[PDB]
Structure formats: structure tokens, C-alpha cells
Amino acid sequence: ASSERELYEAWVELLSWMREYAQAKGVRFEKEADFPDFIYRMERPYDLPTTIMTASLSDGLGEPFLLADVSPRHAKLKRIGLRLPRAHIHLHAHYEPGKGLVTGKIPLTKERFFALADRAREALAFA
Amino acid sequence: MRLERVLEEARAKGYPIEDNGLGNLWVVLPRERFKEEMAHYKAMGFNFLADIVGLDYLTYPDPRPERFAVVYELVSLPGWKDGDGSRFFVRVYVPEEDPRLPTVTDLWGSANFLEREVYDLFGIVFEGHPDLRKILTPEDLEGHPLRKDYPLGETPTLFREGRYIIPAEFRAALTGKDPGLTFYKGGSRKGYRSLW
Amino acid sequence: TLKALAQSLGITLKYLFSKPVTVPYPDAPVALKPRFHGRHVLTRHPNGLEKCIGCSLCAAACPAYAIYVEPAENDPENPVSAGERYAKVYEINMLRCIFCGLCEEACPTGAIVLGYDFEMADYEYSDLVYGKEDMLVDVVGTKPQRREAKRTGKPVKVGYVVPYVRPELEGFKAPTEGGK
Amino acid sequence: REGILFTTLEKLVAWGRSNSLWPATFGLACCAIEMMASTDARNDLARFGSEVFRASPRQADVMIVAGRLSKKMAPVMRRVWEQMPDPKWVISMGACASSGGMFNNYAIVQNVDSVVPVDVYVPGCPPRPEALIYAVMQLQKKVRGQAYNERGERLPPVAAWKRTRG
Amino acid sequence: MVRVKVNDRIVEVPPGTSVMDAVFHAGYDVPLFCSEKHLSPIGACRMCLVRIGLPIQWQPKLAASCVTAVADGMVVDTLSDVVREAQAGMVEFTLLNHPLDCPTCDKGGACELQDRTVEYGLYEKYPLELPVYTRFEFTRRHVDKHHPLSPFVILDRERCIHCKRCVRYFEEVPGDEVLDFIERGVHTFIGTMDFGLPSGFSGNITDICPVGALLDLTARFRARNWEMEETPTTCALCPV
Amino acid sequence: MVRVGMRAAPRVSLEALKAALGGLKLSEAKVYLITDWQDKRDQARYALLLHTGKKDLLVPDAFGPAFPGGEEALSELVGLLLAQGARRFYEAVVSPGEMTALLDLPPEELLKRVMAIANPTDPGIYL
Amino acid sequence: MTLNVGPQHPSTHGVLRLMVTLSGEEVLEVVPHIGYLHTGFEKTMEHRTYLQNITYTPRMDYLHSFAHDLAYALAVEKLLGAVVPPRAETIRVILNELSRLASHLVFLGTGLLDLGALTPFFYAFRERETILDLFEWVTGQRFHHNYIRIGGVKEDLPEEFVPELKKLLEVLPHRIDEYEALFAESPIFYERARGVGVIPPEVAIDLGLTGGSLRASGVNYDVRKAYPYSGYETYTFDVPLGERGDVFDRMLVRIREMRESVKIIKQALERLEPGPVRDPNPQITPPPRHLLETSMEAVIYHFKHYTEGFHPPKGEVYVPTESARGELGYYIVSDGGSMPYRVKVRAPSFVNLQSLPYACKGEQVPDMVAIIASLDPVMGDVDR
Ligand SMILES: COc1oc([C@H]2C/C(=C/C(C)=C/c3ccc([N+](=O)[O-])cc3)CO2)c(C)c(=O)c1C
Ligand code: SF4
Ligand code: SF4
Ligand code: SF4
Ligand code: SF4
Ligand code: SF4
Ligand code: FES
């Protein structure tokens, strides 16, 4: 259905949150990868709000501790996924209308993500 | 009708008959029997002598009998007196250090120019020729271009500020002896053919 | 066959009274097809980011080898291309270029696409190497045309008209058949 | 006397030579058919004054290198240029003539500025008849002294005036 | 010596010979990802699979020619439609989560996966019927990208196809185990807690990686593999 | 084939070539001025290969305006070759890096390559 | 008088040198000197990928070039087993016969101008100009068009191509009938050409004169009829023939060729039903431009195909076709590599020139020009 739109739109919000943490805790954030189905569109149309698909929070020593990814514009089983490297931690987040962003049935609030990122920072970061 | 009798004649004398699954026929005659056999071929009713294509196999990946090879094309026009339409090729190898060949200019005048070209492009001198004079390449040009040990002789491409290209160092395409940019080339880049 | 002289005379006269057929360049705009092979243009995405990712697929498939591409790595703050790679130096020697469409055909990002300018006559070999900033879609006119408009103070008018510009030329602004 | 040494007369004679440019065709290859098409009844270089076409070289000022210049033809064309009156101009037409073109080998002169002094270069394969009109107009304003290059310089009226013939 | 037969050709070959060397020795070809010269073969990429008969008694499953020894009088089949079909399938499984980074990939033309894919991939299925390249249309694997492992080496864990060449090298050749995987399953990725890449022979993996994962920082983004002018010479910094 | 003259010494190259030339008649000889960068002659450097047919002569890259007195020495050189009756003049365009290794290749290879790549030239561009 | 009718002077179109061994106003014998355009296709093509060489192919015969493109394409298709879609085949025969009409127009315009009158050069050229627009419609180029591909053609026909083609096909028959009405009932050309140009079919066969000049002497030998390649088996066709080989019969037979070629253009136009455009085999065809952002195989195949190319199997091949100047063919030797091992071209204008000393022997000195224009050489084809 049309929920698709808000998904990518919601994705941008997510990035803001991520960006915020870098400005908050003074730790390096990086745009990892943009959308290939946006680079290789030559004349074809592209309506999505952003072209950035993957980003991460890297410590001083460069190894990321938090990874976030989104399904491409034409891929099936569209979702957003999260991962903690070295910690075997993965999340499958969807967006349920009216409620908000939900990990299954549990809404994903900004506070939840912020606490998760801080736990990762204290645990996995080397320097 | 005459092509079948050509095959029956040559196979009876033990000359190899080359055939690809595409519909073109090669008949390789040795040097001695070449002149007399092809004279008999013209007598067999071959009006038209289309091509004289000279070949240098110096850099061919698989080895071949001899380096140079001259191929004539004998045809009988379908719309002329009694035209079957029989067209075929005659290949005759010429050694690297023996660039000889008797001409069929006396039979077809078409070998006047054509053989000269093969003498111009390759080191092959045609015996019995009225005039073996360089046709295409400049009169002061030294050598025979189309043989692989003869350079193509390229010039670099030019750009703004010291930025140049040497195309022979720029080519990503592979020849037959080029191993490739990886350890090797196998599979579909060593030869690929669809099965209709 | 004396009649043939008279018939020839008569038809030549009939054409004499038939005035029209010709087109007077430069006074009349040359009618070009939308698929015409002209000066290359580098196209940009809606984001403004440039489409060229500096991959040198245009240069290898060039039968004259006239295309030069030095790459570089994007600056995350102010990126130039979409990926991690852009074209620092993009030169095409129009005296080597033979106008195939092989660089257009092989460009995966749709950046390099032929335009419509043919009015690129110049005096010097060294000046006929058209660069990156000499072909962008934003630019309106050829090198001698822009130099003449600058040393003349009079704006550029291209001497061609097309029924429409292709979708591959998104952003290519040109005179279209008289719509303006 | 070279069409110089008078504030009025040099303008007058440059006007004359520039507008009355009389091409001397040297039809070589597929560029030359695009040179012929620039005279038919749709797009004719038969207006600026180039209606007539002096095949003899003793009578024409503009020589257009139109096609691939194979080496066996280099010297002949050379003398065709030397068989021209001194007030003569040479345009290099095409990619095969301007540079080596795509044929980068033993058979082609990789820039015809080698054998003849080029006035105007015109890329294209073949350069559209309308690009040829643009080049003859380029040369028109060049021989009036109305031509400037990218580097900021005004270009001499007649190229082949600066070469120590031999 | 041992007598071996590949599809029409018979070769004398010393006994300890691997089926892969004997196949290439006979003039035929088969993909190769997991194994590498001077590296211990362990069957991982499963590309070198051939058919084997040892008398006409064909083996049940395709033999890994990378880690299999040869025996006298053995028949090896690499041209049967079964072999090419299976090879195309494994190429698809390898290309599964690849980032689509070829055009900006520093590996360019000298990439083994590209060449073996165009060699053995897309078996001719049986017309003028329109073909589909990939079946996998799901969300692909995304991990950390352009990760500098050392001032000379850069690491893209997405391009890794999970061979063993770099970790096997580091364990075997220099004796410096400073690179190995972290997690398992499809989440596996190369990483280290030794960051400086202490081994002084670290640069050789730069050549071995059949993908653009480990690349040269000091030569990053200068030209494509073909655009470079390759001149073979000898290094005179030291007496070796 | 002899190698006279020296790199980047236009006047010494010219004097040694004066001496080694002698009264050699150049009616059927060939003069190959090898350089890089076709168009820009104002900054050109030049080598010379003289193919007489009976013995050949080499001059390294020492002439041209790129060196002090290379323009005047190249003018004198072309005047000297023209005085002796030369009619067939050629120019070879090599990559700069070639120019150095081309004088160290065996005579047959170097000379074959040069004759294949030669461009007929008007000596007026060097006088 | 061994007179030097030099290269390009006087008005020997297609630069060619002639030593006319000749005393008076007769013609004893003409000794030709060619090679003044030698550029090196047979050699340069050995260093260009099969995909690239389609940029080298049309430029040999720059008038009827799509025959060169089609000959090269078909030979490689046979060598690697490519499939012609019906629509691609119909489009290829359209462009073939249309480039043939254009080459014929240029040939007769040049022949009339070369000795005689100037006017009818323009009218025929007018039509030629229109034809070029059609090409510029689909290929974006006047000639030297790089459109054909090994599998088929590059991309599809625009919406605007077919109506313009219908316009030109409706106006042309009257135009060709007008040229023939002017020329056939020849006022002076009758006393100029009917006698000149002695073409005994026996020696024309012996010297390799295939280019439509032989059937003007009454030999029904056409590759479109002798060796159908591009579907010509499936066409209703009149095959022009001549009573006795001269310049007059040659020109009239070629005009009838133009009318039959227009009829073939219309015939092929009618049978055109939408469909595919090129051989979809990914090993031979680059991926479509739209799934470059979805599939990995797409990107790998695009990268490889446009840097390396493809590798056809080891073997030699050759297939002939009929151009406006006769039998044409490419002898392709491939060693299994990305670049062809050798390409040898049977240049019809090359051997068709052997009949110069013969045909114009005993003819007039001026008529040595009309008999060359009537021989229809394209020195891009001869010199090559
Ligand atoms: C003739 O055809 C051709 O020519 C050429 C060359 C020679 C040439 C001559 C003249 C005389 C042009 C000319 C035409 C008309 C006028 N005019 O004033 O009307 C003036 C000059 C132009 O190209 C080539 C190369 C060719 O391959 C063919 C098939
Ligand atoms: S159009 Fe052709 S010659 Fe021109 S730059 Fe592109 S690929 Fe090269
Ligand atoms: S213009 Fe296109 S093909 Fe060329 S380097 Fe840029 S992105 Fe690649
Ligand atoms: S630039 Fe093109 S059209 Fe001109 S001569 Fe060369 S190949 Fe022919
Ligand atoms: S590693 Fe190879 S297949 Fe993967 S993106 Fe790079 S070039 Fe393409
Ligand atoms: S990083 Fe490269 S060498 Fe190491 S396991 Fe992955 S693909 Fe193999
Ligand atoms: S080579 Fe990797 S499986 Fe044998």
C-alpha cells in the first residue's frame, strides 16, 4: 500500500536521531552508502526524499558499533534493520500507522534508540 | 552440382576438407598440386575468382601448419550459361622462409591486383605474375604491414597538461595470447557459442 | 530523340517557377532530430549532485581513446557525485572524438550524454580539448561561441531547433521548435 | 602588396578576400561528401560568395583538407598547396585530418598541420555541413583580423604567412 | 606417474596432484574462489566442483577438485550441463549480497568474481525468450564500508565473499595472525583487535582478495586496472 | 647504426652532427624528427633518426626551443639537411617515456617502429 | 602521350592516379595507381573489440555503408550463433535498401556531373537530403551511423520515423520516373553512352566485375537472389538486366534498381509488427538500461561487455552480401579473443577497377571520365 512513502520519510527522521548522537557525545558519525537505484537512474524518475541507505557510528579507532540499514526501493520484504557488530544483536523494525515506528508490536521511541546507542558506546567502543 | 564432384575428387586424393557448421567450405591443396589442380578447377566450370586472402598465423594461440596462408575463392555464377552456384575456397600454406606462390593471373585476370595486395601486405611473392608492384602502401614504405610482427605503429592521444594515453597500454580487450587481467580466462571468455 | 532536349528544358523551367526548396543557415534555425550526436553534456541529478562517478567506462569503449578521467574521493561535507567517487578531470579531444555514442551507451549513471551543438569550429588543436566545465548541461553554447559572446558582449543564440529534447537530457535547456 | 599599409585599404582588401573566399576542393574521403552536401539545394555554401569552385589550384584561396589524409597522398596535396597563389588559406576538416582521428596507425598523417598550414579546425565525423559554414565564417572573421583565441590573442589574418618555406 | 583423463585428454601427472591442477593441466577450466596458490585449500567456495568416475562408476556428488587428490585411471567431467548449471547457481549465491559497487570499485577489470561470473554464469536455459539476471530481490547485507585497516590498506566488508585467503595467509605465510572473522552465519565479517596490522608483510592480501575488500590506500582512486601502464621490473631496495 | 650527440646539449649535438655528417649525399635518405605532443612546438624537444638505407644515425633529444639554442640549432639542422638535398621529411610522435627507451632498443626494432609511426612534415615548421 | 591524369585532378573523383598511355583522342590503355587513401581498416580492426569495430565498418564505403555493417554483423552472428528478431531483420533491410537508394543517387549525380550537365545533381541530391533526415531520426547521424549491433540493432525506432518514410516513399516513384524520362530517351547521352564502354560479359566475369555493371551486360547474378541472407528470400522482386554492357544500360538498370528498392522498402514497411529489438543473450547483449540498479549480474555484464567485450569461438568465417557495387564480404578469423584476429574485406570497387584499361580502350579521352563515373568506384572501398 502507500505506507511505503512514510517508511522512507520516517527513515530520514531516524538519521536525524543518529546524527544528533554524534553532535551530543562527540563521536564520529559517517554516511556509509547511498542508494544504488538512485545513482544508476539515468533519465528514470526518483521520488524518494533521500538517497542515503547506510550509516554507522564509528569510535575513535574507526570500528563502528551500531549499524542501520533500509530495504531498497524495489526490494521485497521492506523493513529497517539494526545490528550491533561483535555482539550478535539484530532488530527488525517496521512502522505501524498511527502508533509509530514499532519493533514488532513495541514502538521504537527516540529514547529507546538513544539508550541503546549509549550502551553500545560504553561496551563495544575501544577508544 | 559441381561442388559434390569437387569433394568426391579431392577426398579421393586425400586432401583435407575443412568445414564449419555455418555452411562455408575450405579445401587445402599442397604446393605442388596447387597450380594444376586449380587449373582443373577452372576447367571444372568455375567462372569467378572472388578473393585472395593472405593470412599470418605468427601470433595465433594454437599452432598451425605454416605461418602464411593464401586462400582463393572459385565460384560459378548461378545466372550465367549453366550455373549451379558452386562456390568454395582453396587454402594453400606458404612457409615463413619460403614466400612463394604461382599465380593464376593467366587463368583469371582478377589475380592481377589481388595477389599484388598480398605481396604488398605480406611478404608473399607471387610466381608468374605479369606485374608484382606495390599497390596500396606508399612506394617508400618498407616491409609488409599485415604480418603480426609488423607494428601497427600508433601515436598517443593528446590532452591538456601532460595527460596522455598509450592505447596499447590502455586496452582492456584481450587477444588470443593475452592471459587476461585475472590469473586467466576460462569459460565464456575463452570461447562461447549459443546453441540456437 | 530531339524531344528529350525540349522535355528537359520544360521541366527545368517548371522548377524555375518552383521557388522554395532550401533552408538558409544561419538565418533560419537548422531542424535537428532529438537523437542527434552533438557536444557531450554531463547531466546532474535533481539533488544537484553530479551523475558522473568517475568510472572510466566511457574511456575504455572509445574507439579513438579520446576521454580522460582522473578520479577522486567525494568530500562528505560538500559531495560532487552520488557515490564515493567523482571526476576531477574530464577531457574529450574533439579532434580525436568520432561521435559514436559508446560513452553515452556505457555510462551507467547517465552523466555523459551527447547534446546538439555542432558550432565548435576553432583555430587551435590545443584548444579543442573540451573539458568537464566545458560540457556541463548548465552551459549554453560552444567554446568559440562563448568566447565570441564574451569578447562581443552580446548573448548566445544557438542556431538549431529540435521538436523536443530527450528524457536522457533532463535539464538540457534548448530552443524547442518555437515553443518560446 | 599583402593587402596592408593603409587604414582603409587593409580593411577593404580583408573585406574582399574574406567574403570572396573561393574554396579549392581536395575531396579525399567521407568528410568530402559532407563538403559537397554544403552546396546542394537545402544547405548551400553558395551564398557568401563560394558559388563558383576553382578546381585549378592557381585560382583559389581556401583549401579544405576534407577526409583522411593517407600518407601516399601527403606530398601530392603538399604541392597542391604549393601550387596555390600566396594569399591562400587552409581549413582542416574532420577528425582524421585535424588529429589522427580514430585511425591511429602507419597509414595516416596524425595531424595535417604537419604538411599544410591550417587556418581553422572543425571537428565532427563528418563535421555537419552547418559546422563547415561556421568554420568558413570563423575564417571569414579571422582574415579580417576579427579572431581571438582562448588565450586572449588575436590571430593573424593569413596562416601560411609565418613559415620559412625552404 | 599417475594417468588422468579430462573429457578428451589424457595427462601423465605426479601422484600427489590435485584434481584442479590436473584439469588445468589437461586444458580445461573451472571456477576458483576459495583456493589460491601457496594457500592451503579448504573447500569453502565450492566452485571447483567436477564429476569423477573411478573404475564407469560416477561418484554420487560433485567432487571438490581443490582438496581432492587424484588416482590412476580417473575420468573428470567439467562440461556436462550439470556442472555448468551448479556453477551458475553458486555464482548467484556469491553475488547474493554484493553492493553493486563495480563501477566505482577500485578493483575494476582485475576482479576474479566478474570474470568467473561472465565465464560460467547464466547457463543457456532451454526461443528468443527474455532473461532475468537475479532471483534474490530481498534486502541485502549492509556492513561497514571503506574501513581503513592500516595507513596502506582499506577494508570494505560488504565486498568480502567469505573466502579464507587473508586469514589463511596471515596464519601461514608471515606467522602474524592479525586478521580473522568476528561473527558467524551470513553476519560474518572480517575484523581485528590488532588494528595497526603489525605484520610487515600485510600488503600481499591486497593482491589476493578476489574482491575489492582490501585495497591500497596509497594508490586509492588514481586509475582503473587497465588504465594503468604495467611495467614488470625488479625491486632494488634490498638484496632479495 | 651510430649514436652521436647528447641529450640537452643542442650546440654540442649540432657540432658533432656537423662533423659526422661529412659530405654524405641525402638524396634518398629519410629524416625522422621524433618528439612528443604534436601541437605545441613552442615547447617541443626533438630527437633525430637518419635512415640512409646503407647505415643509420641517431641523435638524442637535444634540439628544440625547450633547450637554450635548440630552436636555432634545429633551424640550422633542417637547413643543413635541406642543403644536402633531402626531400623526404618525417616526424614521429612518441610518448615522453618512450623517447628514452627508444634509443636503447636494438636497431631493427627502433627503426621499424619509427618508420611505421612517421608523419610527413613540412620542414617550414622547424625552420 | 603517357599523360598524368593525376590524383584528384582533373576531376577524377575518388582520388586515383592515372597514366593514360594514349596518343590523340582515342584511348590506347590507362594504367591506374591507387592507394592514395590507404588508412588501414584490415589492420586497425585487429586492435578493436568486436563491439567497437561497428564504428570502423561503415566508413570504408561511406555511401552504402549499412551493407558493410550488415556483412560484419551477419558474419559474427553466424560465428557465435546470434538470433535476428523479425523486427530487427525488417529494420535492417529497410536501412539496407535505403542506403542503396542514397548510394545510387550519389552515383548517378556524380556520373552526370563528371562529364556533361550540372543541374540533375541537385534534384537527386534533394531526395538524398530527405533520406539523410530519416537516418538522423533513428541513428542521430547523417551517415557513418553506429546503430547496428551483433544481436540486432541498438535501440528502437522513434514514433516520427514511419510517417516521414511514407511521405518520401510516396513522392519518390514519380521522381525516379522523372529521372528516367529525362535520361532514358537520351538526347545526346544516347550518342554518348550506348556505344561506349565495351563490356563483354566473359572478361567482366574473368576480372571480378560484380557491381551491377555486369548485369547491364546481361548476367543475372545478385547475392540477394543467389544467396538470400536478410530475408530477401521472402520478397517479390524484379531483377534488373541489361541487353549489352555499356554506360547507358548500366545507368538505366541502376535506376530500375532504385525503383525496385523503393518497392522493397514499402513492402517491408507494411509487414512490420511490434516486438523485440535485439538478441537478448546476455553474453552477447549488454543488460537493459533499467535494471542496472537492481541486479548484480546486470552490472557485471555491463562492465565486462563495455570494457572487454565478448569472446566468440575460434574459427574462420565469411558471408557475402549485395551492396550498390556488388558482392561484399568480410573474412573474419577469430582466435577466441575479445579482439578479432583478422578481418579481410572483399572490396567490390577494388577489383571492379581492373576493367578500367579494358573498357575504355579505344574509347575517347573525355569518355575516360564518363566510363569511370559509370564504373562507380568509392575509393574508400578500393584504398581501404
Ligand atoms: C564526385 O563524387 C565524389 O567526390 C569525392 C570528392 C571529389 C570531389 C569533387 C568535386 C568536383 C566536387 C564538386 C562538386 C560540385 C561543385 N559545384 O560547384 O557544384 C564543385 C565541386 C568532392 O569530393 C569523393 C572522395 C568521392 O568519393 C565521390 C564519390
Ligand atoms: S562519441 Fe565515440 S569517439 Fe566520441 S568520445 Fe564517445 S566513444 Fe569516443
Ligand atoms: S561520464 Fe559516466 S561512464 Fe564516464 S566516468 Fe563518468 S559515470 Fe563513468
Ligand atoms: S572524420 Fe569521419 S567522416 Fe571525416 S574522413 Fe574521418 S572517418 Fe570520414
Ligand atoms: S569486488 Fe568485483 S564484483 Fe564486487 S563490486 Fe568490485 S568489481 Fe564488482
Ligand atoms: S576479505 Fe577478501 S581475502 Fe579476506 S576472506 Fe574476504 S574475500 Fe577472502
Ligand atoms: S577451490 Fe574453493 S572449493 Fe575447491
Query: Does D28 lie at the interface with F, CB-CB under 8 angstroms?
Result: no
**Gaps after residue numbers in chain D (C–N over 2.5 angstroms):** none
G299: cell is 552490472
What burial class does residue G236 get, using C-beta atoms within 10 Å of its C-beta: 0-12 exposed, 13-18 middle, 19+ buried?
Answer: exposed
Which residues, in sequence order, are CB contacts of B182 under 8 Å at separation 6+? E110, E111, E112, E115
User: Where are the alpha helices (H) located in chain C, listed in sequence order?
Assistant: 3-17, 57-60, 102-106, 143-152
Asked whether C84 and C73 are in contact (CB, 8 A), the reply is yes
Question: What's G148's DSSP letter?
Answer: B
CA dihedral in degrees (B164, B166, B167, B169; nearest 10)?
Answer: -130
**Beta carbons of F46 and F89 less than 8 angstroms apart:** no
Report d(CA D94, CA D66) in Å as an integer: 7
Secondary structure class of E112 (helix, strand, coil): helix
Please enumerate in sequence order all residues whose Cβ is within 8 A of that of B69, keeping only pairs 6 or more positions apart, or say none: B54, B55, B57, B91, B92, B93, B94
The distance of Cα B77 from the centroid of its chain, to the nearest Å, equals 22
HSE at residue C43, side-chain half, CA atoms within 13 A, is 26
Q: On the CB side of G353, how many CA atoms lie within 13 Å of its CA? A: 23
Query: What domains does chain G contain, in order, with CATH numbers?
Result: 2-383 (1.10.645.10)
- Nearest ligand (C-alpha, residue E160): 6
Collect all residues of chain B within an 8 Å Cβ-Cβ radius of residue D77: none
DSSP lists the bridge partners of residue A80 as: A70, A93
Cell 582485475 found at = E110
Residue pairs between chains B and G whose CB atoms are closer than 8 Å: 161
First to last CA, chain A: 45
Q: Are C167 and C113 in contact (CB under 8 A)?
A: no
Q: How far apart are CA A109 and CA A116, in angstroms?
A: 11
Residues 78 through 97 of chain D touching chain B, CB cutoff 8 Å:
none
Q: What grid cell was written down for F119?
A: 608523419
Residues across chain D = 166
Strands (E) across chain G are located at: 3-5, 17-21, 29-33, 314-323, 326-335, 342-346
Please state, in angstroms and as integers, the Cα–Cα distance from residue B65 to each residue in B15, B69, B125, F84, G342, following that order: 14, 9, 19, 50, 18
- How far does chain D reach from its first CA to its final CA, in angstroms? 22
Domain total of chain F: 1
- Give the pairing of strands D89-93 and E63-64: unpaired
Q: How far is CA G18 from the centre of its chain?
A: 25
Flag whether E105 is marked binding: yes
Computed on alpha carbons and rounded to an integer, the radius of gyration of chain F in Å comes to: 13
Task: Tell me if D94 sits within 8 A of D126, measured CB to CB.
Answer: yes
Q: Report the sign of the C-alpha dihedral through residues E221, E225, E230, E236, in that order.
A: positive
Cβ contacts of B40 within 8 Å, gap of 6 or more? none
Residue showing cell 584439469: E23
Q: Which amino acid is at D120?
A: V
This entry's atomic model was obtained through X-ray
Angle CA B152–B60–G344, to nearest 5: 60
CA end-to-end distance (rounded Å), chain G: 31
Atom in ligand 4 nearest the alpha carbon of residue D94:
1
Q: How far apart are CA D125 and CA E239, in angstroms?
A: 56
Locate the domains of chain C by residue range.
Answer: 1-180
CA torsion sign for E78, E82, E88, E93 is negative
Query: CA–CA separation, B57 vs G104, rounded Å?
Result: 39
Residue with cell 549451379: B84
Task: Output the CA torsion sign for G342, G347, G350, G351.
Answer: positive
- Check whether the bond before A45 is cis (ω within 30° of 0): no
Q: To the nearest 10°, report the CA torsion of G75, G76, G78, G82.
A: -130
Which one of B142, B153, B158 has the shortest CB-CB distance to F113?
B153
Q: Are G161 and G138 in contact (CB under 8 A)?
A: yes
Mutate to test the pocket of ligand 1, among G11, G13, G39, G64 (most ligand atoms within 8 A of CB): G13
E142 known member of a binding site: no
CB of C65 within 8 Å of a chain B CB? The answer is yes
Q: Is the dihedral of CA F56, F59, F64, F66 positive or negative?
A: positive
Q: Which domain holds residue A121?
A: 1-127
Which residue of E21, E37, E45, E163 sits with most ligand 7 atoms within 8 Å of its CB, as the best mutation to test the pocket?
E45
The angle subtended at Cα E55 by Cα E52 and Cα E58, nearest 5°, is 35
Q: At residue G47, what is the residue type?
A: H
- Rounded Cα distance between C39 and C141, Å, is 10
Q: What distance in Å separates residue A122's CA from the closest CA in chain C? A: 27
Interface test with E, best of B157, B178, B182, B183 (most E CBs within 10 A): B182
How do the domains of chain B map onto residue ranges? 1-196
Candidates G146, G61, G72; CA nearest to G104 is G61
Closest Cα partner for C59 from C90, C23, C25, C82? Answer: C90
Cα D127 to ligand 2 centroid, rounded to whole Å: 14
Tally of structural domains, chain D: 1
The C-alpha cell that represents D23 in the structure block: 574554396
- 3-state class (DSSP) for residue G360: coil
Contact residues for C151 (Cβ-Cβ < 8 A; gap 6+): D148
Residue C60 to residue C66: CA distance in whole angstroms:
9
Rounded CA-CA distance F103/F88 in Å is 22
Q: Distance of CA G324 to CAs B48, C151, D120, G103, G376, Å?
A: 19, 50, 35, 7, 9
Question: Could you tell me which residues are beta bridge partners of residue C81?
Answer: C50
What letter represents residue D36's amino acid? Answer: M
Residue spans of beta strands (DSSP E) within G231-351: 314-323, 326-335, 342-346
Chain F residues within 8 angstroms (CB to CB) of chain D: 38-39, 82, 91, 93, 116-117, 119-125, 127
Identify how many contiguous H helices and E strands chain A contains and give both numbers.
Answer: 3, 7
Task: Give me the residues of E, 23-62, that contact B with CB < 8 A.
Answer: 29-32
Which of G55, G185, G299 has the CB atom closest to C1's CB atom? G185
Q: How far is CA A85 from CA A120, D98, E94, E139, in A?
A: 10, 60, 22, 18
Cell readout for A106 is 513495541
Maximum Cα–Cα distance across chain B: 68
Resolution of the determined structure in angstroms stands at: 3.4
What Cα–Cα distance (Å) separates residue E57 from each residue in B169, E26, E60, E73, F126? 50, 21, 9, 12, 80
D77 CB burial (10 A radius; 0-12, 13-18, 19+)? buried
Buried b (16+ CB within 10 A) or exposed e, F16-44: bbeeebeeeebeebbbbbbbbbbbebeeb
Nearest residue to G310 (alpha-carbon basis) of C154, F51, B172: B172
Strand partners, F119: F91
Can you read off the three cell numbers belonging to residue G288?
Answer: 537493459
Number of alpha carbons in the 13 Å side-chain half-sphere of residue D84: 27
What is the DSSP code string of D28-94?
-SHHHHHHHTTBSSSSBS-SSS-SS---SGGG-SEEEEES--BGGGHHHHHHHHHTS-SS-EEEEES
> For residue F73, how many other CB atoms are within 10 A of its CB?
23
Residue with cell 564407469: E56
Cα gap G288→G274, rounded to integer Å: 18
Query: How far is it, in rounded angstroms, from Cα D166 to Cα F123?
Result: 7
Q: Do C65 and B163 touch (CB under 8 A)?
A: no
| Residues F93 and B156: beta-carbon distance below 8 Å | yes
Angle (nearest 5°) at CA G254 between G248 and G259: 130
Kindly provide the residue ranges of all beta strands, DSSP E only, lying in chain F, ordered along the sequence. 2-3, 30-35, 46-51, 56-63, 89-93, 118-120
Q: In this structure, what C-alpha cell is assigned to residue D85?
A: 597563389
- Residues C12 and D75: their CA atoms lie apart, in Å, by 43
| Sign, Cα dihedral of F76, F81, F86, F88 | negative
Minimum distance, in Å, between the CA of residue F34 and any CA atom of chain B: 11
Contact between A95 and A1 under an 8 Å Cβ cutoff? The reply is no
Query: What own/partner pairs with CB < 8 Å and gap ≥ 24 does B110-113 have?
Result: B110/B49, B110/B50, B110/G206, B110/G207, B110/G208, B110/G351, B110/G354, B111/B49, B111/B52, B111/B72, B112/G354, B113/G350, B113/G351, B113/G353, B113/G354
Peptide bond just before G10 cis, omega within 30 deg: yes
CA distance G10 to G365: 12
Q: In chain D, positions 59-88, which contact chain F (CB-CB < 8 Å)?
A: 71, 74-75, 78
Count Cα neighbours of D68 within 13 Å in the Cβ-side half-sphere: 32
Q: Provide the 10 A C-beta neighbour count for residue G7.
A: 24
* CB E190 less than 6 A from any atom of ligand 7: no
Residue G261 and residue G118 in contact, taking contact as beta carbons nearer than 8 Å: no
Residues spanned by the domain of E26: 1-219
Cβ–Cβ < 8 Å for B85, G226: yes
Instruction: At G152, list the grid cell.
Output: 540486432
* G124-G127-G133-G138 Cα dihedral, nearest 10 degrees: -100
Contact G325, G381 (CB under 8 A): yes
For residue B125 the three cell numbers come to: 611473392
Which run of H or of E encompasses G253?
A: helix G247-270
Give me the amino acid identity at E108: G
Domain membership of residue F37 as a residue range = 1-127
What the block records as the C-alpha cell of C131 is 573539458
d(CA G119, CA G113): 8
Tell me which DSSP letter residue C126 carries.
G
**Separation of alpha carbons A48 and A45, rounded Å:** 10
Beta bridge partners of G245: G199
- Residues from chain G contacting residue C102 (CB–CB below 8 Å): 51-52, 55, 146, 306
Q: Does C123 touch chain F (CB under 8 A)?
A: no
Three-state secondary structure of D127-142: CCHHHHHHHHHHHHHH
Count of Cβ atoms closer than 10 Å to residue G115 Cβ: 17
Please give the Cα distance from D25 to D45 (Å, whole number).
13
| Contact by Cβ (8 Å): F121, D115 | yes
CA nearest to F45, candidates F32, F54, F58, F34: F34
The C-alpha cell at G366 is 573525355
Residue C71 — φ and ψ, nearest 5°?
-95, 175
Q: How many CB atoms lie within 10 A of CB B4?
A: 10
Q: Measuring CA to CA, how many Å separate G328 from each of B29, B109, F43, G316? A: 25, 19, 48, 17
CB E29 within 8 A of CB B190: yes
d(CA E53, CA C130): 63
Dihedral sign for Cα D7, D12, D13, D17, please.
positive
Question: Cell 565478448 sits at which residue?
Answer: G310
- Is residue D98 within 8 A of residue D120, CB to CB? The reply is no
Point out which residues pair with B94 in neighbouring strands: B68
d(CA D101, CA D17): 31
Smallest CA–CA distance, residue D2 to chain C, in Å, is 22
Ligand 2, atom 2: closest residue by C-alpha? C100
E62: phi then psi, degrees, rounded to nearest 5: -65, 130
Atom of ligand 1 nearest to the CA of D33: 23
SS3 of residue B48 by DSSP: strand
3-state secondary structure at position E216: strand
Please list, in sequence order, all residues whose beta carbon lies within 8 angstroms of the beta carbon of residue A98, skipping any fewer than 6 positions away: none
Which amino acid type is present at position F64?
A: G
Q: At what angle do helices G86-114 and G161-184 cross, to 10 degrees?
A: 30
Measure C52 CA to nearest chain G CA, in Å: 15
CA–CA distance, G295 with A40 (Å, rounded to integer): 11
C-beta of residue A85 within 8 angstroms of C-beta of residue E184:
no
Q: In what order do the strands lie in the sheet with D120-122?
A: D23-27, D62-66, D89-93, D120-122
Ligand 2 center–CA C91 separation, angstroms: 12
Residues D25/D53, Cβ–Cβ less than 8 Å: yes
Cβ pair B156:F113 closer than 8 A: no
Q: Do chains D and A touch (3 or more CB pairs under 8 A)?
A: no
Strand-pair category, A80-84 with A100-103: unpaired
